[PDB]
Write a protein that holds these residues in place. Structure first.
Motif, PDB file in Angstrom:
ATOM      1  N   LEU A 143       0.690  -1.058   0.033  1.00  0.00           N
ATOM      2  CA  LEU A 143      -0.394   0.049  -0.176  1.00  0.00           C
ATOM      3  C   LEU A 143       0.781   1.489   0.006  1.00  0.00           C
ATOM      4  CD1 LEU A 143      -2.842   0.569  -0.422  1.00  0.00           C
ATOM      5  CD2 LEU A 143      -2.963   1.081   2.779  1.00  0.00           C
ATOM      6  N   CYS A 144       1.640   1.285   0.949  1.00  0.00           N
ATOM      7  CA  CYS A 144       2.817   2.714   0.886  1.00  0.00           C
ATOM      8  C   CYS A 144       3.036   2.330  -0.815  1.00  0.00           C
ATOM      9  CB  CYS A 144       3.922   2.473   1.922  1.00  0.00           C
ATOM     10  SG  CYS A 144       4.975   3.566   1.819  1.00  0.00           S
ATOM     11  N   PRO A 145       4.025   2.298  -1.657  1.00  0.00           N
ATOM     12  CA  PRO A 145       4.293   1.933  -2.725  1.00  0.00           C
ATOM     13  C   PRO A 145       2.804   2.275  -3.662  1.00  0.00           C
ATOM     14  CG  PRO A 145       5.289   0.325  -1.793  1.00  0.00           C
ATOM     15  CD  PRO A 145       4.549   0.622  -1.243  1.00  0.00           C
ATOM     16  N   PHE A 146       1.830   2.246  -3.108  1.00  0.00           N
ATOM     17  CA  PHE A 146       0.639   2.282  -4.088  1.00  0.00           C
ATOM     18  C   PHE A 146       0.490   3.539  -3.342  1.00  0.00           C
ATOM     19  CE2 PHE A 146      -3.715   1.803  -5.666  1.00  0.00           C
ATOM     20  CZ  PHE A 146      -3.733   0.541  -6.560  1.00  0.00           C
ATOM     21  N   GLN A 147       0.189   3.979  -2.215  1.00  0.00           N
ATOM     22  CA  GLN A 147      -0.243   5.732  -1.759  1.00  0.00           C
ATOM     23  C   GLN A 147       0.918   5.773  -2.801  1.00  0.00           C
ATOM     24  OE1 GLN A 147      -1.598   4.607   2.259  1.00  0.00           O
ATOM     25  NE2 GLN A 147       0.150   5.299   1.952  1.00  0.00           N
ATOM     26  N   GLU A 148       2.046   6.085  -2.763  1.00  0.00           N
ATOM     27  CA  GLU A 148       3.445   6.161  -3.336  1.00  0.00           C
ATOM     28  C   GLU A 148       3.352   6.885  -4.938  1.00  0.00           C
ATOM     29  OE1 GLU A 148       7.280   5.081  -2.521  1.00  0.00           O
ATOM     30  OE2 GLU A 148       7.518   5.862  -0.907  1.00  0.00           O
TER      31      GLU A 148
END
Ligand code: SF4
Ligand SMILES: [Zn+2]
Ligand SMILES: [Zn+2]
Ligand SMILES: [Zn+2]
Lengths: 677, 380, 191
Positions: C148-153
């Motif tokens: 999710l963190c790479p997705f959010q980025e």
């Protein structure tokens, strides 16, 4: 309840009375008031017995002097036990609705094997030796020697019955065969002896045909019981056949071998009166002469004794003394057992019959056997030709003999087949809330070719293919069991072999299970059991059999068993063996009976007898199909019983297989809905 | 004697005249009597119910290819089954339906036991183009149904419906033992055949307490299905039977607010096509799972999502409205205006509620007893 | 090994999930296949005041509506207005390209499976399940950090206006709050 007939009131266990039962009671009361014989026809095996017994009891109550003894001769032991239990139910109903007992006695009679308490004779399966062992254990000499109390094993039931059972009677209480056995074993008496002592003081009694049609035992069992008595032969559509077989004997190599084996022992016992000792020795060679003679047939009923009086030059008179010798000489010899002795007795019986009865008989010798025709098998059979011989002693000794069954469609042939004077000509057709049967005759198949079981077309491929297709597409519309009847075992096996040869029998197999009835009793019984268990569940099955087989009448296809009954062709008896043709000639030159008419009558009688067993009970329903165009002609339809005629509409008399299947589907679909009582 | 062989009926003797014109009163009385032709009950049958886990067994043998029902047995059977499922889910809020198809001496569980109407209809429509081959196997289908329903709670009524077209069934083992086991499991089995009566089906229905019927035509088929729709009567109190179920509010999303949160539906995620990522829908009260259809049991937390109006629609049976007391207009000493419709009271009879003692005309009384099911005065 | 490999090959989506969970150290392969197998009298005072105010009532015409009020109401009811919001994710079918959409669906499936396992574990009636729920929470956190963190980025880099992550955060936050509440109850039960 209390039915009010024109001059009486009769109590009935069932509150509801069908119109057929009421009309049957009317007709039977008319016959009883007419003091004459008659013939009846009812379509239900159940419900006839209760009405008959109720009307008999009512008539006895109203007219004790007119009727004193009742006989309800049936075909087998299950019928005897079921009518006994029905009478028991009727008596219980009368007792509970009235409150007081009546001095009426009812007993069932059977063979000594059925009624015996000795555990030393029950396990064995020799029906010809049980009577001999019983005679050896207890007899006149046994009674004479019991005075000194000889220490030897013997039956003691009679030795107690003669001193304790000949004084106490049984005025009240109808007793079944098991009840008689229980009473005998608790009192230490023989059930047969107490039955013999109790028939004189009795109201009703039931037994088989063999105790009246066979003259050798009817006189002993019924001599002066009642001059004015009523006898009825329920389910007697084949009374002529059993009457013919009553005076029919057969001879083979085994009989003469046994006789020549046992005569040496008899002579050895004798050397340890003379008018028969030397008389019996030379009788064997006269009949063994035909063994060495290779001839097709010899017929000389009057001249047989003439030829006997030439080879050995023996007078005809002493033959008449043979039968009365059996009760005189043999008991003096103290025969240990009747084993290895029955052929000697039957030879004497045959000699007495040919000496006395030779006006309407024929002597036939056949050098033929099944699959081994000519090796060594000259079979001599003194086949009877007239059914009136076995029926005179019951017509001349009784007043209102009644012949009733489920199939007596031609009421004009029975009075002339045997000397008879009917005054009834009465038929009854059962009615219900819905048509419980849908008879139909299927003619040409989908190929517009007749499916007649003609002799010239038995090997025809087209008719076999049409039969297979009919059985296939029929097996998918009527569930849980179809009973099919063929003309003969040979035709049945030739048809199933052809079906197996083609890729058609597998289609029937994947729908219903196929079971084939054979001549083996155990194999037939296990096949019937597995057919029943397969029809219990949803698998469904087909039972293939023959019209003239022991399975045709041995079982009843009650509801949910055999919803469809198929007749593959008109069942015609084989014209061979030179026995049917002799009877045809006798009927032609004596009773003016057409040969074709009699053959059609026999064929349709067998077909209706084997097709009418699918409807037992009001709630029961079934389908009946005839796979032959010959059934379409009126001369054969008219031979069907009246209770099936009205349901055989003219619309379906020659319809093809597809329309027959459609009719069956519609009938089964519309008959599954609930009906009320 | 006979009823028609006596005296001829003279129905016209009812009307009479005393003032040369009183027939108007008689026809007014006839018109008044014409109304109130109902029993004040829309159903008048079972006033309660019980949760049913119904399994429908469908034959898939060659006999389904028969054209007794146009076009063939299979298509008509599936259409009537779709109608039956729709009606059954309409009249049963918390019931479940499973579908088993028997073919080639085997049984396949076509659809899982659930309360979703769309899934069952979709499976039935897909099954229209199946291949009919082999022979049915009642033993396998009943074994699967028993295995699925063995662990179900006792308070639920376990029912199995069999539509048996073929007249023959292949059983790998004895079937009567299975029937005894079903009887011990208190599973109700009902069979609706198509061709004729079969002994095994009748025995099974009689022993399991169900009913066995045979179809005459398509109309009779529909009538039998409609009869099977109605729930069985339930005992007054059996056990501590309850169920944890949620009531998902239909919260849609609008871009005007900052909480416009798109979400893929759990049901749509399993489809081959792109799942509908709509603005909003039904959010699970327990795990906030999004669903588009109701009633659907939640895939994540296992909670049951039901619509409150569907449950509440049957609440009037629990508290039926008492019949109002009929009083002639002359004998009522009060207001002459109906409390419900404000209309002037001119009818010969006025109905008064036993609770609030208000006045209702014939039309308003019929409307209250038939549709409203609640007395307007008692509400106040 | 050979049996395990064939299962992944038949379902590449599961194979992608297997790599995204096991290779990324989010979950162990042992645990991966383990699961697969009102107020005071002021109210009366206000009632009396309104009764007196409406005691002398006269109908009005001009005060009912004004041109400005009608114009404002029409603007609100005009397309694109407050009540007639016409945007509503204008081209969301073509917005956030389907390459991201497939990844979003995969994340949704993974989160749904993990939450299904968590809720199947719930309620915790045995001490064995207590560790299992903690392991599930750790797996959820690892999966979030990994994906999710790479997705959010990526979403922030492309500046997608849709709050796709918001729903996923809502479910994860709800699960975390439920677990924290249950742990608090467990601590209270031991008091
Ligand atoms: S006398 Fe009776 S009990 Fe004794 S052997 Fe003969 S039949 Fe049996
Ligand atoms: Zn949920
Ligand atoms: Zn009103
Ligand atoms: Zn009220």
């Amino acid at each position: 309840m209390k039915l009010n007939v024109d001059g009486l009131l009769v109590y009935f266990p069932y509150d509801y009375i069908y119109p057929e039962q009421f009309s049957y009671m009317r007709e039977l009361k008319r016959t009883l008031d007419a003091k004459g014989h008659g013939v009846l026809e009812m379509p239900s095996g159940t419900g006839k017995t209760v009405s008959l017994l109720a009307l008999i009891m009512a008539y006895q109550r109203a007219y004790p002097l007119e009727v004193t003894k009742l006989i309800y001769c049936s075909r087998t032991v299950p019928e005897i036990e079921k009518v006994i239990e029905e009478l028991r139910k009727l008596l219980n109903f009368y007792e509970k609705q009235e409150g007081e007992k009546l001095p009426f006695l009812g007993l069932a009679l059977s063979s000594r094997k059925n009624l015996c308490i000795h555990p030393e004779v029950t396990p064995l399966r020799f029906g010809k030796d049980v009577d001999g062992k019983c005679h050896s254990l207890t007899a006149s000499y046994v009674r004479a020697q019991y005075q000194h109390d000889t220490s030897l094993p013997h039956c003691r039931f009679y030795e107690e019955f003669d001193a304790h059972g000949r004084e106490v009677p049984l005025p009240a209480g109808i007793y079944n065969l098991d009840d008689l056995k229980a009473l005998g074993r608790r009192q230490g008496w023989c059930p047969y002896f107490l039955a013999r002592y109790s028939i004189l003081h009795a109201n009703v009694v039931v037994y088989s045909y063999h105790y009246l049609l066979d003259p050798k035992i009817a006189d002993l069992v019924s001599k002066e019981l009642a001059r004015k008595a009523v006898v009825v032969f329920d389910e007697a559509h084949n009374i002529d056949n059993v009457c013919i077989d009553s005076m029919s004997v057969n001879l083979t190599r085994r009989t003469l071998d046994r006789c020549q084996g046992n005569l040496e022992t008899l002579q050895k016992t004798v050397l340890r009166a003379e008018h028969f000792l030397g008389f019996l020795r030379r009788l064997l060679e006269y009949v063994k002469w035909r063994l060495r003679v290779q001839h097709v047939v010899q017929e000389s009923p009057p001249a047989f004794l003439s030829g006997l009086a030439q080879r050995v030059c023996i007078q005809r008179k002493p033959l008449r003394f043979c039968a009365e010798r059996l009760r005189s000489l043999l008991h003096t010899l103290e025969i240990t057992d009747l084993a290895d002795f029955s052929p000697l007795t039957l030879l004497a019986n045959f000699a007495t019959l040919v000496s006395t009865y030779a006006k309407g008989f024929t002597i036939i010798i056949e050098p033929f056997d099944d699959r081994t025709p000519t090796i060594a098998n000259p079979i001599l059979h003194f086949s009877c030709m007239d059914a009136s011989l076995a029926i005179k002693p019951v017509f001349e000794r009784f007043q209102s003999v009644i012949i009733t069954s489920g199939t007596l469609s031609p009421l004009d042939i029975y009075p002339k087949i045997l000397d008879f004077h009917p005054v009834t000509m009465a038929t009854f057709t059962m009615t219900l809330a819905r048509v419980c049967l849908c008879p139909m005759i299927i003619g040409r198949g989908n190929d517009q070719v007749a499916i007649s079981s003609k002799f010239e077309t038995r090997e025809d491929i087209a008719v076999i293919r049409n039969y297979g297709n009919l059985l296939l597409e029929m097996s998918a519309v009527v569930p849980d069991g179809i009973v099919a009847f063929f003309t003969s075992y040979q035709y049945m096996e030739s048809t199933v072999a052809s079906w197996y040869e083609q890729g058609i029998l597998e289609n029937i197999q994947r729908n219903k299970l196929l079971f084939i009835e054979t001549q083996d009793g155990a194999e037939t019984s296990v096949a019937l059991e597995k057919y029943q268990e397969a029809c219990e569940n949803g698998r469904g099955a087909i039972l293939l059999s023959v019209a003239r087989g022991k399975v045709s009448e041995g079982i009843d296809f009650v509801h949910h068993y055999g919803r469809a009954v198929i007749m593959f062709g008109v069942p015609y008896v084989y014209t061979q063996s030179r026995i049917l043709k002799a009877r045809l000639e006798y009927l032609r030159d004596q009773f003016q009976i057409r040969e074709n008419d009699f053959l059609t009558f026999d064929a349709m009688r067998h077909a209706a007898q084997c097709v009418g067993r699918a409807i037992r009970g009001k709630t029961d329903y079934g389908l009946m199909v005839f796979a032959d165009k010959r059934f379409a002609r009126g001369d054969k339809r008219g031979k069907l019983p009246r209770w099936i005629q009205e349901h055989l509409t003219d619309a379906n008399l020659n319809l093809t297989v597809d329309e027959g299947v459609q009719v069956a589907k519609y009938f089964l679909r519309q008959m599954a809905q609930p009906f009320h009582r | 004697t006979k009823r028609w062989e006596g005296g001829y009926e003279r129905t016209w003797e009812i009307l009479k005249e005393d003032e040369s014109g009183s027939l108007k009163a008689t026809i007014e009385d006839i018109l008044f009597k014409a109304k109130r032709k109902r029993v004040f009950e829309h159903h008048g049958q079972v006033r309660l119910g019980m949760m049913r886990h119904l399994y429908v067994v469908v034959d898939g043998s060659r006999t389904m290819e028969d054209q007794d029902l146009k076009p063939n047995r299979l298509t008509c059977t599936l259409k009537l089954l779709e109608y039956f499922v729709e009606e059954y889910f309409d009249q049963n809020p918390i019931s479940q339906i499973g579908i088993i198809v028997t073919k080639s001496k085997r049984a396949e569980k076509l659809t899982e036991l659930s309360g979703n109407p769309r899934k069952h209809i979709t499976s039935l429509k897909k099954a229209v183009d199946m291949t009919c081959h082999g022979e049915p196997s009642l033993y396998n289908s009943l074994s699967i149904a028993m295995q699925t329903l063995k662990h179900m709670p006792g308070h639920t009524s376990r029912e199995v419906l069999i539509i048996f077209s073929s007249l023959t069934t292949c059983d790998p083992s004895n079937i009567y033992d299975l029937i005894k086991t079903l009887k011990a499991a208190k599973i109700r089995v009902s069979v609706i055949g198509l061709s004729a009566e079969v002994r095994v089906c009748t025995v099974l229905a009689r022993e399991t307490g169900g009913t066995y019927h045979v179809i005459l035509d398509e109309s009779h088929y529909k009538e039998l299905l409609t009869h099977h729709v109605s729930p069985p009567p339930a005992s007054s109190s059996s056990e501590c039977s309850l169920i944890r179920m949620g009531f998902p509010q239909h919260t849609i999303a609008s871009l005007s607010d900052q909480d416009a949160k798109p979400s893929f539906s759990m049901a749509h995620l399993d489809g081959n096509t792109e799942p509908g990522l709509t603005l909003g829908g039904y959010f699970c009260p327990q795990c906030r799972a999004k669903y588009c259809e109701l009633p659907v049991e939640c895939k994540i937390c296992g909670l049951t999502l039901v619509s409150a109006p569907h449950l509440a629609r049957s609440y009037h049976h629990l508290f039926p409205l008492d019949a109002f007391q009929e009083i002639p207009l002359e004998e009522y000493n009060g207001e002459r205006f109906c409390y419900g419709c404000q209309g002037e009271l001119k009818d010969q009879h006025v109905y008064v509620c036993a609770v609030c003692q208000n006045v209702f005309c014939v039309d308003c009384d019929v409307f209250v007893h038939d549709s409203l099911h609640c007395c307007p005065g008692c509400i106040h | 090994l050979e049996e395990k490999n064939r299962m992944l090959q038949e379902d590449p989506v599961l194979f992608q999930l297997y790599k995204d969970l096991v290779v990324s150290q989010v979950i162990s392969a042992e645990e991966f296949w383990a699961n697969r197998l009102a107020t005071s009298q002021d109210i009366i005072n206000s009632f009396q005041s309104i009764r007196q105010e409406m005691e002398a009532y006269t109908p009005k015409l001009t005060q009912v509506l004004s041109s400005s009020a009608a114009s404002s109401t029409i603007t609100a009811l005009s397309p694109g207005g407050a009540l007639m919001q016409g945007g509503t994710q204008q081209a969301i079918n073509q917005m956030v390209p389907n390459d991201i959409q497939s990844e979003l669906k995969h994340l949704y499936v993974a989160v749904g499976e993990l939450l299904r396992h968590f809720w199947s574990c719930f309620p915790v009636n045995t001490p064995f399940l207590e560790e299992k729920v903690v392991k599930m929470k750790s797996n959820l956190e690892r999966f979030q950090v990994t994906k999710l963190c790479p997705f959010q980025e990526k979403i922030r880099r492309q500046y997608l206006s849709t709050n796709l992550v918001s729903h996923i955060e809502e479910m994860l936050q709800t699960a975390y709050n439920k677990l924290h509440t249950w742990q608090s109850r467990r601590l209270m039960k031991k008091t």
